[PDB]
Amino acid sequence: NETFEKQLKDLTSNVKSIQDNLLEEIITPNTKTEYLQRFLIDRFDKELFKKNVPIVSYEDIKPYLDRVVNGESSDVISARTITGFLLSSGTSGGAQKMMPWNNKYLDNLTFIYDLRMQVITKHVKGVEEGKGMMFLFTKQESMTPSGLPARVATSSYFKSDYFKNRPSNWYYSYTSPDEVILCPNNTESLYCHLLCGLVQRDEVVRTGSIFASVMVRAIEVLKNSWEELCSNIRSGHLSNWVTDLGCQNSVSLVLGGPRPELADTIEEICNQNSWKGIVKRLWPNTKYIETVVTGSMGQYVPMLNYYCNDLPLVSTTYGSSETTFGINLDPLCKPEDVSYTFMPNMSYFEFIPMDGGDKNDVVDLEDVKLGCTYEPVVTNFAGLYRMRVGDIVLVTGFYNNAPQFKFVRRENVVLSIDSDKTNEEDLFKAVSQATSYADTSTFPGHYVVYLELDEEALSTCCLVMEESLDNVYKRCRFKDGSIGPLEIRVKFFS
Ligand SMILES: Nc1ncnc2c1ncn2[C@@H]1O[C@H](COP(=O)(O)O)[C@@H](O)[C@H]1O
Numbered sequence: 001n002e003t004f005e006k007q008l009k010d011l012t013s014n015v016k017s018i019q020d021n022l023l024e025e026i027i028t029p030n031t032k033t034e035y036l037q038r039f040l041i042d043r044f045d046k047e048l049f050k051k052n053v054p055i056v057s058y059e060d061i062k063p064y065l066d067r068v069v070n071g072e073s074s075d076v077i078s079a080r081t082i083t084g085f086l087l088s089s090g091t092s093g094g095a096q097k098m099m100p101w102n103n104k105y106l107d108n109l110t111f112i113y114d115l116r117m118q119v120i121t122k123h124v125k126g127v128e129e130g131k132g133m134m135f136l137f138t139k140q141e142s143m144t145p146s147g148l149p150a151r152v153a154t155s156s157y158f159k160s161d162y163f164k165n166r167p168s169n170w171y172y173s174y175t176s177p178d179e180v181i182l183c184p185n186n187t188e189s190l191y192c193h194l195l196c197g198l199v200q201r202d203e204v205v206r207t208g209s210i211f212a213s214v215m216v217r218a219i220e221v222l223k224n225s226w227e228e229l230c231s232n233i234r235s236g237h238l239s240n241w242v243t244d245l246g247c248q249n250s251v252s253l254v255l256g257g258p259r260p261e262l263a264d265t266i267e268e269i270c271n272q273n274s275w276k277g278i279v280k281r282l283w284p285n286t287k288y289i290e291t292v293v294t295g296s297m298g299q300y301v302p303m304l305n306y307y308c309n310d311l312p313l314v315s316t317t318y319g320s321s322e323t324t325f326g327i328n329l330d331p332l333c334k335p336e337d338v339s340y341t342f343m344p345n346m347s348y349f350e351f352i353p354m355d356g357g358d359k360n361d362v363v364d365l366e367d368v369k370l371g372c373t374y375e376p377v378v379t380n381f382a383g384l385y386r387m388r389v390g391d392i393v394l395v396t397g398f399y400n401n402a403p404q405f406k407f408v409r410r411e412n413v414v415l416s417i418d419s420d421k422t423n424e425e426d427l428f429k430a431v432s433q434a435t436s437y438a439d440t441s442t443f444p445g446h447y448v449v450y451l452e453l454d455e456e457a458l459s460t461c462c463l464v465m466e467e468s469l470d471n472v473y474k475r476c477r478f479k480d481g482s483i484g485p486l487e488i489r490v491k492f493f494s
C-alpha cells in the first residue's frame, strides 16, 4: 500500500522527467548501433533525435528486422541483445508482423502485472485468500532462421521464469496447474481449465482471460461440455481424449478421487431452465471478471453481463507487440468509460494527431490534448525507434500529469471477432477473388459478406474469400474454433 501509493503518485506525477530519462537510458548504449549511426545520433540529445530519426512504419524498417530474424547480430538496431520475436496479430503483406524482443519486454510486463494487482486490491475486497479461474493459453512458437523463437506476447511470458517463478500470492494463484496453462493444445487446456475450476469452485474469487472473446468462448464451451466435465468429477478420472501428459498428471491430482456428490451439485445447477447468471451460480464467491472489454471486445459486454449477473467487468491493460502501454486506474467503471493511463517507464511515447484539434506534426506524451485523437509512436528497449503502432487513441483526461486514453480502433481494421484483425485491404483481396459485418449473435462469431443461384459457385466464393484471409484468422477459424464459417449473403457458407 504505502509503497504502492507512493509508487503510483510518482509515476503519474513525474511523467516529463521519467520520459526524458527513459529516452536517454535507451539512446546512450545504442549510439553505436548501425541504425542510430545512420541517423547521426552519437550522443543523447532529444532535439537531434526528434529532428533526425525518422518516424517509421513497420514496412519502413522491415529490412533491418529481416536481417536480425535471419541471424545477423542484433547490434544493427539494439545493444540489448535480441533473444526472440513477438508475433503481432497485425499483418504486413498477409504475413504476421514480427517485432524484436528481449527480457525488457517481460520486465515491463511484470511491472504492469504487479501495478494492476495493487490497483485492483485497492478497490476490490475479499480476494486475497482465494484463487482465480483464469483462462490463460500458451501458443506454440514459430522458429526463425536465426534459430530464435517467435511467440505471441503472453506466450513469451508463460514460457519463461517470469511466469514459472512468479510471486506466491492470491493474484498469481490459479485453479489450473501450470501444466494446463502451458499446454499448447488449447482445446485440451480450456477443457482442463473448466474442470479444475469446477473442482475448486468455492475458492474462485475472480475469473477472466486476456480478451473478452476468450471469456465468452470458455462459457460457451462450458455450456457444451458440462455433462462430460461432471462425469470426470464423478469418476475422479480425466477423459481419455486429453493427450497432453502434463494435463493428465496434474489434473488427475486435482481430481484426487471420485466426487459423486460434487458432480450432483454441479449437474443440478446446470440443469436449470436458463444459462442466465451461470458464472455467478457455479462460482458464487467471484468478485469480478477480469478481461479486456474495450475496442472490438466491447461487442461481448452484453453476453458477459448476461452470464455473470452484472459482476463488474474489469478491463486492466492496453498493450501491443511493441510495448505494454498502461493500465486502467478506475477499474470499477463501465466498459464504455474505460481509459488507459500510459506508464512513462514502459517506452518513450510520441503521438501523431489524427484530427484537426491538434495541428502539430508529432507531440510528446506530456503534450497531448483533451478530446483529440492520436496514433501512438514507440521507442523501445529492443531496437524500435519512433515506430507507429497503427492504433487510434482519444485523450479523455489526465491523472496527475499522466494522460489517459480511450482505445478507439486499430486503423484500417474492418472485421474482428477474436484475435483476428482483418483490414480493408485483406477484404478487398478476398472480394476480388470472389460490404461486411462481424456477426457475434451466435457462437462462434463469423464474418458476413453482403454481395436459382449456383450454390456450388457461391459456396466456393465463401471459400476463396476465407482462404485469402490471414494466418491469425485461419488459426481462430480452423484450430481454435473461435470463428465459424464465413457467410455470404447475396445465404451461403464456406
Ligand atoms: N485493452 C485493449 N483494448 C482494446 N484493444 C487492445 C487492448 N490491448 C491491445 N489491444 C489491441 O490489440 C492489438 C494487438 O497488439 P499486438 O500484440 O501487436 O497484436 C493492439 O495493438 C490493440 O489494437
Ligand SMILES: O=C(O)c1ccccc1O
Pocket: 153, 154, 210, 292, 317, 318, 319, 320, 324
Ligand atoms: O498481458 C496482458 O494481460 C495484456 C492485456 C492486454 C493487452 C496486452 C497484454 O499483454
